[PDB]
Amino acid sequence: LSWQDYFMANAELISKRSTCNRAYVGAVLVKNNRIIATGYNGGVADTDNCDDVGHEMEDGHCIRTVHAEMNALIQCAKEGISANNTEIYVTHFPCINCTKALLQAGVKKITYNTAYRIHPFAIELMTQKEVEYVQHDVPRVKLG
Amino acid sequence: LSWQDYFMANAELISKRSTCNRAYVGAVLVKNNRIIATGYNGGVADTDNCDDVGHEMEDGHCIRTVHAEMNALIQCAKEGISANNTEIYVTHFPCINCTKALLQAGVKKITYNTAYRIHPFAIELMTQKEVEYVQHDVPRVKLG
Amino acid sequence: LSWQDYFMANAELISKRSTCNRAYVGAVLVKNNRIIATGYNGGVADTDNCDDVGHEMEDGHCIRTVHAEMNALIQCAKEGISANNTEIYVTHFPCINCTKALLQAGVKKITYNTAYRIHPFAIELMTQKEVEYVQHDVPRVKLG
Amino acid sequence: LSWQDYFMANAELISKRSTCNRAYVGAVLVKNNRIIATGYNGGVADTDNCDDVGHEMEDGHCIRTVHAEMNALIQCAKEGISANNTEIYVTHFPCINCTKALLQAGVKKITYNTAYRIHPFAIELMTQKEVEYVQHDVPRVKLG
Amino acid sequence: LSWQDYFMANAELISKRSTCNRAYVGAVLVKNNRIIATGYNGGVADTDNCDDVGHEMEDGHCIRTVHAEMNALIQCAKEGISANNTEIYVTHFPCINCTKALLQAGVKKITYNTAYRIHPFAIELMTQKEVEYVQHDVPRVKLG
Amino acid sequence: LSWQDYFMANAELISKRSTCNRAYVGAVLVKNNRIIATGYNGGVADTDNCDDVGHEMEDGHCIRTVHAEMNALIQCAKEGISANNTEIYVTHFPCINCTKALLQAGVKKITYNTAYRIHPFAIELMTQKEVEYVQHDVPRVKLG
Ligand SMILES: Cc1cn([C@H]2C[C@H](O)[C@@H](COP(=O)(O)OP(=O)(O)OP(=O)(O)O)O2)c(=O)[nH]c1=O
Ligand SMILES: Cc1cn([C@H]2C[C@H](O)[C@@H](COP(=O)(O)OP(=O)(O)OP(=O)(O)O)O2)c(=O)[nH]c1=O
Ligand SMILES: Cc1cn([C@H]2C[C@H](O)[C@@H](COP(=O)(O)OP(=O)(O)OP(=O)(O)O)O2)c(=O)[nH]c1=O
Ligand SMILES: Cc1cn([C@H]2C[C@H](O)[C@@H](COP(=O)(O)OP(=O)(O)OP(=O)(O)O)O2)c(=O)[nH]c1=O
Ligand SMILES: Cc1cn([C@H]2C[C@H](O)[C@@H](COP(=O)(O)OP(=O)(O)OP(=O)(O)O)O2)c(=O)[nH]c1=O
Ligand SMILES: Cc1cn([C@H]2C[C@H](O)[C@@H](COP(=O)(O)OP(=O)(O)OP(=O)(O)O)O2)c(=O)[nH]c1=O
Ligand SMILES: [Mg+2]
Ligand SMILES: [Mg+2]
Ligand SMILES: [Mg+2]
Ligand SMILES: [Mg+2]
Ligand SMILES: [Mg+2]
Ligand SMILES: [Mg+2]
Ligand SMILES: [Zn+2]
Numbered sequence: 052l053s054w055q056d057y058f059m060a061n062a063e064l065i066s067k068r069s070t071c072n073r074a075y076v077g078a079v080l081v082k083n084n085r086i087i088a089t090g091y092n093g094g095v096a097d098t099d100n101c102d103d104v105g106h107e108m109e110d111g112h113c114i115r116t117v118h119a120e121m122n123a124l125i126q127c128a129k130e131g132i133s134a135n136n137t138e139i140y141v142t143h144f145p146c147i148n149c150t151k152a153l154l155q156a157g158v159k160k161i162t163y164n165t166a167y168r169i170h171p172f173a174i175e176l177m178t179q180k181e182v183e184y185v186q187h188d189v190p191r192v193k194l195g
Numbered sequence: 196l197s198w199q200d201y202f203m204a205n206a207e208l209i210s211k212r213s214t215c216n217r218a219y220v221g222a223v224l225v226k227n228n229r230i231i232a233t234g235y236n237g238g239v240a241d242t243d244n245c246d247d248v249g250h251e252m253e254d255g256h257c258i259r260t261v262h263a264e265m266n267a268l269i270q271c272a273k274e275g276i277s278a279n280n281t282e283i284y285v286t287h288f289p290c291i292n293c294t295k296a297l298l299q300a301g302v303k304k305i306t307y308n309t310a311y312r313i314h315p316f317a318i319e320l321m322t323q324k325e326v327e328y329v330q331h332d333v334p335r336v337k338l339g
Numbered sequence: 340l341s342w343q344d345y346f347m348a349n350a351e352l353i354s355k356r357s358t359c360n361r362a363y364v365g366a367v368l369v370k371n372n373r374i375i376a377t378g379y380n381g382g383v384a385d386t387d388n389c390d391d392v393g394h395e396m397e398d399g400h401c402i403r404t405v406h407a408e409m410n411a412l413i414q415c416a417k418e419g420i421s422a423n424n425t426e427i428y429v430t431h432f433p434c435i436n437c438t439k440a441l442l443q444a445g446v447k448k449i450t451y452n453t454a455y456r457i458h459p460f461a462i463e464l465m466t467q468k469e470v471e472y473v474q475h476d477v478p479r480v481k482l483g
Numbered sequence: 484l485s486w487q488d489y490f491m492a493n494a495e496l497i498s499k500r501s502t503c504n505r506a507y508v509g510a511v512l513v514k515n516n517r518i519i520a521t522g523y524n525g526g527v528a529d530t531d532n533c534d535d536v537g538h539e540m541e542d543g544h545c546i547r548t549v550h551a552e553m554n555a556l557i558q559c560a561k562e563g564i565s566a567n568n569t570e571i572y573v574t575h576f577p578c579i580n581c582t583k584a585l586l587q588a589g590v591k592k593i594t595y596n597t598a599y600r601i602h603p604f605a606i607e608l609m610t611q612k613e614v615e616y617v618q619h620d621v622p623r624v625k626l627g
Numbered sequence: 628l629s630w631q632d633y634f635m636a637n638a639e640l641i642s643k644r645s646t647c648n649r650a651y652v653g654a655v656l657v658k659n660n661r662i663i664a665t666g667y668n669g670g671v672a673d674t675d676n677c678d679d680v681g682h683e684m685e686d687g688h689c690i691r692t693v694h695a696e697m698n699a700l701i702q703c704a705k706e707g708i709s710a711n712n713t714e715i716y717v718t719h720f721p722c723i724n725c726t727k728a729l730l731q732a733g734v735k736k737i738t739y740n741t742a743y744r745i746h747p748f749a750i751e752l753m754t755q756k757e758v759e760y761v762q763h764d765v766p767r768v769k770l771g
Numbered sequence: 772l773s774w775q776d777y778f779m780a781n782a783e784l785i786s787k788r789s790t791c792n793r794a795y796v797g798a799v800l801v802k803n804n805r806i807i808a809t810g811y812n813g814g815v816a817d818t819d820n821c822d823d824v825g826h827e828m829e830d831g832h833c834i835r836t837v838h839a840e841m842n843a844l845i846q847c848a849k850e851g852i853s854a855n856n857t858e859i860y861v862t863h864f865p866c867i868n869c870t871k872a873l874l875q876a877g878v879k880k881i882t883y884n885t886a887y888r889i890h891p892f893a894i895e896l897m898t899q900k901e902v903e904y905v906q907h908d909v910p911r912v913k914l915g
């Protein structure tokens with residue numbers, strides 16, 4: 052079980068806690084092969100979740116949740132854990148807002164499973180910050 | 196000079212460092228009357244700023260910058276400084292995205308200089324998180 | 340996917356990285372539903388593992404490895420991460436030595452997949468430290 | 484009063500708090516000539532001590548206590564103080580279990596007063612981790 | 628608005644909270660262009676202030692307050708924030724006691740607005756510690 | 772060997788490292804019966820000590836050194852170790868300046884070996900901060 056595979060396995064696993072059915076996304080922040088924070092797609096802690104009260108629609112989009120990647124950063128902010136010089140493992144490549152936040156927090160590498168359209172501006176930013184992005188599949192694993 | 200005036204003063208002050216001339220915004224995160232982090236409206240660190248290379252326009256707004264409030268939070272995440280049970284002073288009441296993140300981070304009070312229209316969804320979230328929001332003016336001070 | 344299932348799942352998962360084929364053990368330390376540290380059954384970092392150079396046998400058992408539970412604790416010590424008032428998820432209920440250390444470290448709950456015979460001395464210590472111990476199964480999950 | 488002598492003086496001194504009369508052992512973790520944690524030979528905090536209720540005998544050995552060296556590491560784990568890149572001062576050279584834990588926590592040097600039989604495997608591990616072990620006497624000091 | 632100017636602006640601003648009218652002094656500790664602690668001239672927190680009960684005179688001097696510079700260091704001590712490798716911005720160059728404390732805490736540079744008589748011993752200490760001291764004016768800024 | 776005797780013993784012990792022969796002072800900061808910082812009477816780190824280059828006399832006293840109690844506090848500031856809600860053990864009851872700083876730092880108890888005349892202003896401050904002060908002797912111990 053390789054380190055890369057373990058972290059993607061974990062991204063996949065925490066994505067399963069997503070509480071807005073329009074997106075199951077998971078994210079894992081890693082420093083020297085340790086998990087230091089994780090996120091999934093869900094509403095503000097101790098507020099309503101889409102699963103229970105329905106989506107918060109605006110402009111044909113649901114806006115209730117904090118994204119998985121942003122949630123991982125906000126865990127670090129909340130708990131006072133350093134995100135600097137970490138790397139992230141995500142089920143889906145991040146939106147441009149999340150990317151900007153990840154790069155600003157000092158995330159040095161992004162490994163993703165799926166990706167649909169990567170923002171060119173996200174690619175420009177990653178180039179300037181010398182941050183690599185690399186696809187890797189979720190390992191086939193069975194537990195229980 | 197009151198604590199409230201000191202912090203709003205420093206919000207205004209940091210707002211001036213904004214590097215996108217479409218919005219001068221400043222944010223000050225505070226725990227037990229100490230400034231623990233600040234943000235202004237700016238592009239990702241060590242990348243191009245609008246002041247230098249122009250705006251990054253999309254659907255009519257500039258997407259180059261991280262917002263001041265988000266930047267303050269990302270400082271906490273990057274440096275591993277706890278934002279839990281803090282309050283924030285902002286020159287402008289936050290967008291819904293920033294509001295979500297501040298609340299997720301454990302911010303318990305938002306003091307703002309100018310608010311324009313507070314999103315009903317933001318009022319709902321703040322109600323559920325029992326977060327106080329209050330207008331306060333930038334004090335008149337002359338330095339030098 | 341429940342919090343309990345998520346953590347036991349991740350215990351099983353990290354257990355697979357064990358580098359001594361006589362015991363596959365995994366440990367997950369948790370504070371406020373965040374993973375703060377993990378351990379597996381392995382030799383001292385940057386030294387020989389059994390997988391590569393054989394076991395270090397003595398009086399009929401291998402002494403090369405640090406146990407998974409102890410490794411999780413040592414991660415906390417090495418990195419200066421607080422293990423106080425945490426809980427742990429382990430694939431196997433800990434030996435008496437590990438039990439002592441977890442309790443000394445401030446661990447307040449032990450959730451285990453398989454326990455075999457819990458030492459009477461361990462029951463005494465857990466009673467005095469008011470530490471709960473509870474069996475929970477590895478959930479059935481397929482990844483990929 | 485040399486730094487080496489001060490730390491050994493301290494090891495000796497904290498060994499005096501040992502609550503199992505079958506071993507008076509003291510340990511001091513040091514980073515840049517500062518004491519960051521200490522340990523002595525005693526049972527789990529807030530549980531019974533040998534001094535009061537008798538030894539916990541098994542296999543002709545007392546197993547009630549956490550060793551001094553392990554207690555120093557567990558203080559770091561408990562309080563979230565980093566043991567990485569520290570050095571330790573101990574009254575007696577550590578057993579193999581303790582040695583493995585010390586090396587795993589990033590302890591870089593071991594200075595001991597007495598030593599009886601050093602485990603060859605402990606010597607192999609110390610060689611591989613490039614960790615030196617050096618005898619030094621307790622200074623003759625009188626206070627009061 | 629330059630970084631130097633922003634920090635001096637802040638020193639000036641926090642000096643305005645001074646609660647002994649015989650000295651309005653402000654100090655700002657900075658690490659990588661972030662404010663990590665500030666101080667002003669005032670009595671021990673939660674004790675009487677000169678503004679309310681009068682000065683504490685001894686030897687023709689008021690001795691009630693902790694100096695601004697020392698208060699900034701003591702905030703770091705109190706809150707457990709590292710002052711090592713910081714730089715300080717102060718309205719007035721520090722007395723010799725404060726200077727010794729600043730250099731001992733690892734402050735690497737002192738930028739001051741006014742200065743009356745710099746202690747030669749302070750200059751000797753700054754030379755030995757390779758710490759530069761540099762005058763800079765408070766920027767002319769108007770808010771509100 | 773009691774906790775109180777252990778700490779006073781270590782105050783005496785560190786006092787011996789003083790590098791100004793006009794005063795041998797030692798300070799030990801303690802949180803939950805752990806030593807978190809110590810100070811002795813000494814010049815700024817990596818500068819000249821009196822032992823080597825003579826005293827720095829002014830108005831009849833030596834001003835070269837940082838006092839032991841202040842040094843203990845500055846260790847906390849430098850290293851980012853929290854001195855809040857600690858207690859201190861000192862060989863001599865502190866000067867008024869040190870008293871102010873300890874109290875500002877959140878020290879809640881002063882245990883001292885020798886006090887000579889406690890400043891009325893110090894009694895006032897300690898009363899307002901509800902800080903206990905208590906005499907305790909250096910225990911008789913012989914090491915080696
Ligand atoms: C604990 C934790 C929460 N979060 C985020 C995801 C959600 O947006 C939010 C939920 O926090 P909570 O509401 O406190 O968690 P919960 O046990 O109630 O689970 P849920 O509401 O999802 O049923 O916090 C993380 O991103 N990572 C984490 O490790
Ligand atoms: C230091 C600091 C930066 N930031 C943010 C604002 C910007 O988006 C980004 C810029 O960081 P940098 O590019 O590293 O700062 P700079 O000195 O180059 O100043 P600038 O580029 O603005 O001319 O970081 C804060 O929000 N708070 C802070 O305390
Ligand atoms: C990173 C990490 C290591 N460890 C422990 C397990 C092993 O005993 C030891 C190995 O660390 P390393 O030797 O540094 O890790 P590695 O990448 O070489 O993997 P391996 O040697 O196992 O093939 O550290 C944890 O318990 N938790 C962790 O998060
Ligand atoms: C405070 C402290 C405790 N310990 C360990 C040693 C013992 O195994 C255990 C005792 O903690 P406690 O029982 O909390 O300490 P105590 O005041 O009751 O003293 P004792 O029980 O020994 O009479 O904690 C250290 O190793 N280092 C330390 O600095
Ligand atoms: C919060 C804070 C306090 N201090 C110091 C300055 C004063 O000596 C002391 C006052 O703390 P407090 O008395 O707790 O602050 P306050 O709100 O009562 O204001 P004041 O008493 O001045 O009216 O703490 C700093 O130096 N920096 C800081 O950031
Ligand atoms: C390491 C340490 C230093 N100090 C203070 C005391 C001195 O004022 C100053 C000296 O630090 P250094 O000069 O770095 O220590 P040293 O090994 O050179 O010893 P010395 O100069 O005394 O012979 O730092 C403490 O108060 N506590 C500590 O734990
Ligand atoms: Mg919830
Ligand atoms: Mg820049
Ligand atoms: Mg290895
Ligand atoms: Mg006890
Ligand atoms: Mg006050
Ligand atoms: Mg020296
Ligand atoms: Zn939704």
Ligand SMILES: [Zn+2]
Pocket residue numbers: 118120121145146147148149150
């Ligand atoms: Zn996103």
Ligand SMILES: [Zn+2]
Pocket residue numbers: 214215216217245249250251257258259260
């Ligand atoms: Zn722009």
Ligand SMILES: [Zn+2]
Pocket residue numbers: 262264265289290291292293294
């Ligand atoms: Zn915003």
Ligand SMILES: [Zn+2]
Pocket residue numbers: 358359360361389393394395401402403404
């Ligand atoms: Zn083996």
Ligand SMILES: [Zn+2]
Pocket residue numbers: 406408409433434435436437438
């Ligand atoms: Zn074990």
Ligand SMILES: [Zn+2]
Pocket residue numbers: 503504505533537538539545546547548
């Ligand atoms: Zn015993």
Ligand SMILES: [Zn+2]
Pocket residue numbers: 550552553577578579580581582
């Ligand atoms: Zn041992």
Ligand SMILES: [Zn+2]
Pocket residue numbers: 647648649677681682683689690691692
């Ligand atoms: Zn006064």
Ligand SMILES: [Zn+2]
Pocket residue numbers: 694696697721722723724725726
């Ligand atoms: Zn001063």
Ligand SMILES: [Zn+2]
Pocket residue numbers: 790791792793821825826827833834835836
């Ligand atoms: Zn002298």
Ligand SMILES: [Zn+2]
Pocket residue numbers: 838840841865866867868869870
């Ligand atoms: Zn003093």
